[PDB]
A paper describes a structure:
Human [name]-glucose dehydrogenase ([name]) catalyzes the oxidation of [name]-glucose into [name]-glucuronic acid, an essential substrate in the Phase II metabolism of drugs. [name] is a hexamer that exists in an equilibrium between an active (E) state and an inactive (EΩ) state, with the latter being stabilized by the binding of the allosteric inhibitor [name]-xylose ([name]-Xyl). [name] forms a hexamer arranged as a trimer of dimers, with each chain containing a NAD+ binding domain (NB domain) and a substrate binding domain (SB domain). The active site is located between the NB and SB domains within each chain, which are both flexible and undergo a rigid-body rotation to open the active site and bind substrate. What makes this allosteric is that the binding of [name]-Xyl changes the structure of the hexamer-building interface and increases the affinity between the adjacent subunits to form EΩ.12. This remarkable conformational change is controlled by a buried allosteric switch (the Thr131 loop/α6 helix) that responds to the identity of the C5 position of the nucleotide sugar bound in the active site.
Numbering used by the authors:
A (entry chain B): 2 to 381, 390 to 465
B (entry chain A): 2 to 381, 389 to 465
C (entry chain D), D (entry chain E): 214 to 381, 389 to 465
């Protein structure tokens, strides 16, 4: 079987970039990304894409209108597809069982039902997300219960490993591709078909094939392992600040062990993003449901440590301001959950900002890529306390403290002599990302009090 | 300053092999390893070394009597040394503050006092252990408090990263060398002198230098990160057993992430060794003293998960045997804490064995390298009644209800399992806690075994 | 006093029988046994008797819970805490039985019922009455409402306004009172039978299945559909019943 | 009753004065202040008075703890739990003060005192008595014995047999009763002053330091060596005292 037409339901951070790269690498495959959100689709068809990803604009514009299409016509996209990706959002349940812990499968199930309604013949349906939580199983359950004559839907799991801000490089040179399908002739035929798509640019030895649950469990575990590294080095950063060591030097010594590796050892205010907290929460919830409370409380520490890391950074800021920040202007530099994205989901900047707002601080928030309206929504008191600055010098003008929450490269190149001149004194810089390392002498000479994670 | 004579106090798994390799790589340096334990020193001077390390015998015999010496004369070895390593044991406190959590620095302090008493002039004193817990700081205080005219002792931290069973390969090609010393001219002079020793075979760019606390905290943290990797994959192994997945397949998918890496993702009955549990316990204890209870309970989970992993494995064995194992013969294959060592310290085999002995099982224990007398001590009336030490693995399995593989010795996958099955009682179980009998599963099932392994149901 | 104590005890003994067999129903579900078969073997002991051994979503009515609660309260006031806890288990088991049933419904519907239509067949606390006091149907309905389900409730005798009162803004959004059971099941994801009205055995489940969303679940909380299991499965239902799994 | 209550209260008020200033001593140690200087400023308030404001390892004697314990017990029996837990803090603070002092000693000796000689100067519960009842020296000694320390205990008036009884196997192995304070300090790692005997201020600390192991610690639990701090530091002792750090 040869996949010639791909439909992706979901034009978000996963679906949009992933399908754009597929189209770029597979000129003979027609790739149509569809979405219920018309303004998002319109943006994909515009000169201003709805998400910020380095290199994405160049990739999209090389293919869009040739073999890459963006449409709100979900039904027609499904009808013609050989392969249908499901790349929709799974919000955390806000009520009921698993409130705040369990992923909400309501959109996957609605997509699955819509696919059945609009499908005839043979199609491969692949769930693709960063945190798949029983997604493939729930889709299969719908398909098993909603058969039609000559309708033959295969369900694959194909977790997406891209990280936002480096999505395009990750998609073009993935460490591995993971595909789960049934261990039947039909399932294996579907797995091989999807492998053949990826083999246009991914070596076969980097494509792992397994069954659907092992695929999803591997993603859940891999995400949790990554988040655990951050919580581990963040825990050491607290120990470093308490004993006179420097977490960056300790991290270097740790990371030179080739059994540990030197990646993901950057202490920070805390990890954010739509993946890690959601992933660990769902892993904990899954373990509780399986009567594995020891495993549940093991992984819960990854989240507990992340929450403590944020709280400890916020209280350092408040303590440095002598425990009153009411009506004090504070510049927040960086609102995205990491650099090179406009995504703010679960950003530590949200949590740090809210801790300071609870102290009555007047926050002036600058981020080079997060849209102003997103910051307002994330923080919604906002009217009274929050200002969105057009440039970082405006945010720092008359501030008592500058809090760097996102490691945008532009922040290490600011004119900090100019910033100091217009700040109130004592002028603090709270570097929650270690982005100002190596400027510490210069900043102290200028007159700042510099506080950073993992150093005192 | 050029180090020409090295003394190492402590002829154990760290001091012995480390100094043997230094002598091997530095023919112009005289290296004398000393110890209060005369029988250990005699063994180092014999054809049968007191520890088992692959390649160690070859290294020792190429150097011993030339520039490598083993002696019980600690005082004279110190007196002539340019550099004195301290590589002694720091047992966990058995009473008082930190009972069963904090380590006991009493031997470090006794060595430091003995060095000052027996030293004149300039010497570098280097604490070398796998789990340094305020060791350099203690030695420094004793020294600062016990000065002599013209006595000038420099204290370095130089943690040892070797793993037992691969000590020689690790020492000859370390991922990095870590040296801590004071940020003073004298401290840096001392650091550079020790660097010059390691530079005989270690590239300079793989030598990290820092202050003494940062060197010890890096070691404490690095050990804890490794132990975490195991507890994390072991936790996933429990999830795999509960959901029909295979932890070995999941581990492969995880490890292909170059940000995670593919090493130390082998699920097991639980990590053992004199490093990991001690390291995490001391890290937890340190964080409670610094009023970091959130950090303390974060790392405590690494130990709690390891303890749960052992208990879960033991209860799978007991459940498979109808919850009654009284007077049932069970073969324990593997007692060392990992393969290619005779060391049993904190071996999971001890804990699994003790769980089964509490159920009244008759254990027959075979290990190719752990001495019989060591197994008896580790498990110590009840040992006399219930524990037999077998001289070959077929004797251990003869008439057994179950075979429990606790150590991944390569010989265990090569056993004649058809022969073993013929003389076992039925149903005959194999409990693999090292995922080693993997790929033999079809054969073993055809023979008639019930195979149970960690992270697969 | 002896008269009143005798009444308090007899009610509590009856409520215990139900909680005891309901506790066994959970064990049956967990071990592959059938509580109806186990109940038959138990009840043939003439010292136990064969009445009040019908596992269910949970006992209701203005008597049993109130009676056990008052027995527990009386014991607490008399400084008999051991006796108090002993009888409290009768209530705790009944509450657990309701919760276990409700979460089984939610579990079968992929852990989410927001905007899903669930038919509730039976709201009275038992058949052949319009009384809803302490009806298990109220508790099951509230669990599903708390999960965002759109309930369509049918009962042949409970007045429409009583059901609204028993479930009371959230009722306005989530609760519909149906005039017949086919209207309640039209477009439903699941049918939850909470009261053992004899008419529920006689519904056209073929017709119900045609108009339901798939997979179509029936949750028989009363064992009223026993013996129809083969036909309902042939029609295509996923049948979940108390004490069998 | 009023007579007895007045005695019960007066003793408890005095013991409070000690626990309150001892609590400030811990805060002083944590913040760089000197409890003796703070006590002077407090005590110059004529409404507070300047007596019983000497921070210490903790009050002892057969009166104060017994008195507060009985006051707490009386209040508990009268269903005054708020009053009970108020006065209990006087005891809890005294116990914490002793524990904090003991662990400071252990912390200074590298977290280990096994087989280390430690001189205990003062075993009576206060100076100018042979009474040891509830003496802080007993508790400090027991904390150090539980850590494996070899105690050499000197007191100018407490009889030897009384000290052994107060500390009672483990006493035989770990406890030595010295005839003079220089013998207790001979080869010691640390000297712990638990009782404010005037003779301790006048000891030849030059001679003591010579034959002590180094680093040589003096733990002044009574502030009896104030003003000798300079002389003692010049001699080479690391002096730790309650309420200063
Ligand atoms: O499958 C997948 C989807 O989930 C993830 O991608 P993400 O897009 O969430 O980005 P990320 O690079 O991990 O950053 C996550 C958070 O950790 C923070 N972070 C990241 C690295 C670090 O060393 N320290 C640190 O604090 C980042 O500053 C950010 O706040 C997986 O990495 C990806 O493989
Ligand atoms: O500094 C140092 C001193 O401490 C350690 O060395 P170790 O000699 O203790 O040996 P090891 O290889 O880690 O094994 C430890 C335990 O983990 C078990 N283990 C090891 C790897 C694995 O993937 N799974 C697993 O269960 C082993 O089977 C064994 O029971 C550091 O690795 C070293 O860098």
């Amino acid at each position: 079987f040869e996949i010639k037409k791909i439909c992706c339901i979901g034009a978000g951070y996963v679906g949009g970039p992933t399908c754009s790269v597929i189209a770029h690498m597979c000129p003979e495959i027609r790739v149509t990304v569809v979405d219920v959100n018309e303004s998002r689709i319109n943006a994909w068809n515009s000169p201003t894409l709805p998400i910020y990803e380095p290199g994405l604009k160049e990739v999209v514009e090389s293919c869009r209108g040739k073999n890459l299409f963006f449409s709100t016509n979900i039904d027609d996209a499904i009808k013609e597809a050989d392969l249908v990706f499901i790349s929709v959002n799974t919000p955390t349940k806000t009520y009921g069982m698993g409130k705040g812990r369990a992923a909400d499968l309501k959109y996957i199930e609605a997509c699955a039902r819509r696919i059945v309604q609009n499908s005839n013949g043979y199609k491969i349906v692949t769930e693709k997300s960063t945190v798949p939580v029983r997604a493939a199983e729930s889709i299969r359950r719908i398909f098993d219960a909603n058969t039609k004559p000559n309708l033959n839907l295969q369900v694959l799991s194909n977790p997406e490993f891209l990280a936002e801000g480096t999505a395009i490089k990750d998609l073009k040179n993935p460490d591995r591709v993971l595909i789960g399908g049934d261990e039947t002739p039909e399932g294996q035929r579907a797995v091989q078909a999807l492998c053949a798509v990826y083999e246009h640019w991914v070596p076969r030895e980097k494509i792992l094939t397994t069954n659907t649950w092992s695929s999803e469990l591997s993603k859940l575990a891999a995400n949790a392992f990554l988040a655990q590294r951050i919580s581990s080095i963040n825990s050491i950063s607290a120990l470093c600040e308490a004993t006179g060591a420097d977490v960056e030097e300790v991290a270097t010594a740790i990371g030179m062990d080739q059994r540990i590796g030197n990646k993901f050892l950057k202490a920070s205010v805390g990890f954010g993003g739509s993946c890690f907290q959601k992933d660990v929460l769902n892993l904990v919830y899954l373990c509780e449901a399986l009567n594995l409370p020891e495993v549940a409380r093991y992984w819960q520490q990854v989240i507990d440590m992340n929450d403590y890391q944020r709280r400890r950074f916020a209280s350092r800021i408040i303590d440095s301001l002598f425990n009153t920040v009411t009506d004090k202007k504070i510049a927040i530099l960086g609102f995205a959950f990491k650099k090179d994205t406009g995504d703010t989901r679960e950003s530590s900047s949200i949590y740090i900002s809210k801790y300071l707002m609870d102290e009555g601080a007047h926050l002036h928030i600058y981020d080079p890529k997060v849209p102003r309206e997103q910051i307002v929504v994330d923080l919604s008191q906002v009217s009274r306390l929050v200002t969105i600055s057009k440039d970082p010098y405006e945010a720092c003008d008359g501030a008592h403290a500058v809090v760097i929450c996102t490691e945008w490269d532009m922040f290490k190149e600011l004119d900090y002599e100019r910033i100091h001149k217009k700040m109130l004194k004592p002028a603090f810089i709270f570097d929650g990302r270690r982005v100002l390392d190596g400027l510490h002498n210069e900043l102290q000479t200028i007159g700042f009090q510099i506080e950073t994670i993992g150093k005192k």
